[PDB]
Ligand binder design. Sequence first.
Ligand SMILES: [Cl-]
Ligand SMILES: [Cl-]
Ligand SMILES: [Mg+2]
Ligand SMILES: [Mg+2]
Ligand code: NA
Ligand code: NA
Ligand code: NA
Ligand code: NA
Lengths: 9, 9, 236, 236
Amino acid sequence: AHSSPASLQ
Amino acid sequence: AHSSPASLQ
Amino acid sequence: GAMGSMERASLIQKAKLAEQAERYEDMAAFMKGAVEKGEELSCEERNLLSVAYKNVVGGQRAAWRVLSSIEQKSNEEGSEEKGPEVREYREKVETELQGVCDTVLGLLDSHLIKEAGDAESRVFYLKMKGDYYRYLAEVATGDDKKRIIDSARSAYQEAMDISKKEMPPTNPIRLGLALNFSVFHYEIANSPEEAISLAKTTFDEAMADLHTLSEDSYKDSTLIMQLLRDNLTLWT
Amino acid sequence: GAMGSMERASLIQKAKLAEQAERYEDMAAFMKGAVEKGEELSCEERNLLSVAYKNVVGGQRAAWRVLSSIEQKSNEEGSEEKGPEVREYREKVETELQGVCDTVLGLLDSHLIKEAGDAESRVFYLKMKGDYYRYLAEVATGDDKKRIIDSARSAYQEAMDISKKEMPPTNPIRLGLALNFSVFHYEIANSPEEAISLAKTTFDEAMADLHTLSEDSYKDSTLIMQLLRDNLTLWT
Ligand SMILES: [Cl-]
Ligand SMILES: [Cl-]
Ligand SMILES: [Mg+2]
Ligand SMILES: [Mg+2]
Ligand code: NA
Ligand code: NA
Ligand code: NA
Ligand code: NA
């Protein structure tokens, strides 16, 4: 499964 | 330019 | 700390250089130094901190998975004995991973979370706290496994409560939080139905709010929404 | 050394595990420990040593190139002043690179090369010595640049002399040596014609010896020959 990118606007 | 692979037989 | 003599602004500048050079261990050390200056972090700086440590732990998690797989094969019937080396080296990588997670959790506890009052910062940091407890949970096996899992759950839940009250459903931090809490449910908490329900509700509520967004915000939000969709396609 | 208490065979086993996990810094530390046991290395072990340190220095070289490019742009007309940070961080990476090269050269000098009597081992190690002086030369700027370049040249030349007398033209070590000496000529020694001549002669003499080879040796040799061809296509 995919988790979130580290950089979030 | 390409140099040698590290592993050489 | 070895960064105590360097200016905060210089640490941030070098963190960005280290990112360009793909020197993520350096990047993390620079950002740790910046955090230890004691000032709150801007949005860009919070993202640098997360990028740095996510890449460091990411390499450790990938290595741990390779070594754990070799170790598990060595414990099947018919597998020749090879001695303690595989376990020892898996333990070495695991201990280093735990150390990085503990460093991050230490920074969040001293004192990033307590000084974070705005929803965007507080949710980002609480999400990070859930994430690094989740990484600890991925390798946990003994008496502390249940408490590590509950620490991840508690951090994610506090972040979720704030994000639902204070952020629009399309906010990338809110979306990434929900994405990662859903992964926690599926992979850590043995709760695939909760994982699927959260991913679906999150996706649908974001879809209904896209019309409010600019072209650039639309692109930010839909990028995370696609990851929710990708997970739902894997899980259903 | 931190590996002094670990069995030689365990160090080699863990080096192979670290390779599978893409943990090349660990791999290099394990192989350094194995070398420091004082026994000669087998062919497989020599290849593990080279794989480990080539990947470590490879990451440092890539980072150094990124940082050096940023530094050079900062020194063009019209570029705003940004302070000492870019130079400082380039110097940090450079010093770490130099340290790795010095470690490798130290292992070769104490005592891998002096105990290597067979052509396959002696040529491999002398090639490595030329390679790590070449990496030092890539970042050298001051009074020692000429002597670093000549140390690379001398090591490669001794290896070439042995390889031409003792190895067939298709031997992968001989081919990789010639490939890298040609890169030295082109990129370090400002001798592109010598680089091209060496690559062409090496390729042609290997081509004429392929008929002697088994299917598997043919594949080993032609893989290196293709790199000579790739370079000739870039350089001509
Ligand atoms: Cl170990
Ligand atoms: Cl620095
Ligand atoms: Mg709001
Ligand atoms: Mg011979
Ligand atoms: Na300054
Ligand atoms: Na063993
Ligand atoms: Na043993
Ligand atoms: Na500056």
